[PDB]
């Protein structure tokens, strides 16, 4: 009667139909790739329980029998002195088989329909984590069952990341890409926290129901992504995106995607940054133990503040790389200006709580900014490069190459950290410094290119059409 | 690529724009009137705690001092022997002032803009329950504070029900009204359960935070109803409803709404059904105590199964009243066939658990079916009667009359149940039987009318235009 329109409906009216499905696809492929990081965690928490020093344990009525072993308490293929030398046998049977699958199970994303290929992966990840969980209810005590699962569970969870920036690549253009897909990259830090929290419930008590419940959540999300994944903007008659600058294009060959002018240098740079991010997080508890004399209940908060700094860095490196028309030169500067900050953290870390946090957030925002910006912005940019000439299709091969060359370094992390550990606890830091200096060396051709690319438009004095 | 549209989007495409805002307004005015039943409960749970027999209580170091009173344990204006005779002084200071407000604070719904009138009530209900809750944090121990709140809290929570079937009246026609607004009437049973569950948390411990949290939830919902309540279908240019069978109409007078041909008989029938529904629920624990010798932990489930039977009855009486073109003749039959079922429950109740539930669900579905169908179907029907001739507006005066004449009987429930209780515990049952026989007597004119209304169309042999 005597009212105009309520301000909520007058606010939601202004967003046109263009900006509604483009807001749908972010909210959908945010949960789709958050469930993978939810279902990847719980081998990290159950790493602590499966071996216990049960000379300090309640109920010694399980036949100690003149000081025998830890058979009655710990799990039986992880009971003896090789528990540290077999857990590494388990997890390396994932990180290897995930970095071989990423080069191949992105190539199938070029050919198959994308929605079926995504749902037939999210209905198998939640089956294979669950079949890892089916050891407690059947009392399986052989080591060979617990490694042929995490191999077959490492060919399935490939299918996320080549088929998540394939959906987002088909809708968005060269608008504010580094900012949208920088805010959007909060899933790799909102997945870890919910993984550590949900799998933290059933740790002690009975541990079989710490894997099966994320394996149910992932396969439940695997059919909401079956019922609602609109791939192309023309299938529901929206507007097609910008120019990223008849017959539908068929495919691309794998070797034909290597000749794109950025895909080699933007991958053997990124292998030397995931290795830095693993080396630092492996090094930091061994640093704060023997020097800082610091409470270990807050180091778990430190290893979360590092990824919160990563969230901040994934947007700070995005805005600047948008408004300066160059993205390799942002990553090179934020890698060069990172090593004095980590050297200063090594020199100044003697404070307990106060000066540590502010020196740790900055080190979190300078080695996970340029890890984000090369796998969420230029990976959706080199795939839409002008040299494809429109008569091809390559967005799930460039992403596949960049992420597989990323995860090979994550596989070679523990294969080197345990090699220089007995020869000193400080060689790790020098390997970190060498890898971070070498990281801003592969980009040198692209930095040399983009300096001239700036100076062309500068020396013309606003050169235009 | 090689996929058609996903079945979720192909399912949601078929519902046109007509059936989207009409699905919005149910989901909105379901929560709007669920929050009132959420914020009406917690005087029921704290009725038990404020008086305690603390001769059976831990910590007697609060100066018993040669067997003194219950001063140290119970609350101070509810400590002596008159605790039963003052709690009734509190709650009757609500149910009276709610049944005087309903005749007047629906009439303001005719004049004011509806969205502002609803939000200025839901931002005061959550203030007045909260100011009832501000006694624990200030240690208020006078009886007169705890009755001038529940009077002023009983003029505010009037504004729900005349302004909830005013929104739903403007959208829906004579379609499947008795079925939609019968499924929709599940809020008066989904509110009670969440009220008993949320207020059940902070009972013992500290009880001040059992009122303030529902008073925060209601005033938070009071602005979501500010931002999103589209009243008329023409304000967002939808289709106007059916014919319920220029200048916008101004108003109606209060005495002018009484001359509608149903509004008198459909209210002094309903006062004699809420009284039946209160008398039965007051009578049933006194029945199962002295005869059945039954566990009192399941009587709380019995008093919920009665309202679940009410949910079933509110739909079973709706379908039949739609497909027989007569609604008073459904209520009369379901009231006449109710008293033999309650008499049979009185004669057969000696079983412990087995035969009691099936005889209680039926008694739940025959005295809360015809309480729903007269306040959610014919109240949105007599207001849209043909005798208004289109040049008036009366939907928040017919609802006001029917619900106020309903709640006067709920006020006269406890004003009579405590009057025949000392003269026997079985006079309550005879008062129930007398009221239920008298309930199907006020409808007799309308039953006599609708029998002829059927026989006109019957004796013509498919008489039509």
UniProtKB/Swiss-Prot annotation, chains A, B:
PROSITE patterns cross-referenced by the UniProt entry: MFS
Glycosylation sites: 53, 62, 68
Topology class, membrane: Multi-pass membrane protein
One of the record's GO cellular component terms: endoplasmic reticulum membrane
Activity modulation: Inhibited by vanadate but not by chlorogenic acid.
Reaction catalysis annotation: D-glucose 6-phosphate(in) + phosphate(out) = D-glucose 6-phosphate(out) + phosphate(in)
Biological processes per GO annotation: glucose-6-phosphate transport; phosphate ion transmembrane transport
Pfam families: MFS_1
GO molecular function: glucose 6-phosphate:phosphate antiporter activity
Transmembrane stretches, start-end: 19-39, 88-108, 118-138, 145-165, 189-209, 210-230, 268-288, 300-320, 328-348, 357-377, 400-420, 428-448
Compartments it resides in: Endoplasmic reticulum membrane
InterPro entries referenced in this protein's UniProt entry, alphabetically: MFS, MFS_dom, MFS_trans_sf, SLC37A1_2, Sugar_P_transporter
Database matches in Gene3D superfamilies: MFS general substrate transporter like domains (1.20.1250.20)
UniProt keyword annotations, A-Z: Antiport, Endoplasmic reticulum, Glycoprotein, Membrane, Sugar transport, Transmembrane, Transmembrane helix, Transport
Expressed in which tissues: Detected in intestine and pancreas. Lower expression is also detected in liver and kidney.
Coiled-coil spans in chain: none
Role played: Inorganic phosphate and glucose-6-phosphate antiporter. May transport cytoplasmic glucose-6-phosphate into the lumen of the endoplasmic reticulum and translocate inorganic phosphate into the opposite direction. Independent of a lumenal glucose-6-phosphatase. May not play a role in homeostatic regulation of blood glucose levels.
Family, similarity comment: Belongs to the major facilitator superfamily. Organophosphate:Pi antiporter (OPA) (TC 2.A.1.4) family.
Protein name per its UniProtKB record: Glucose-6-phosphate exchanger SLC37A2
Primary gene name: SLC37A2
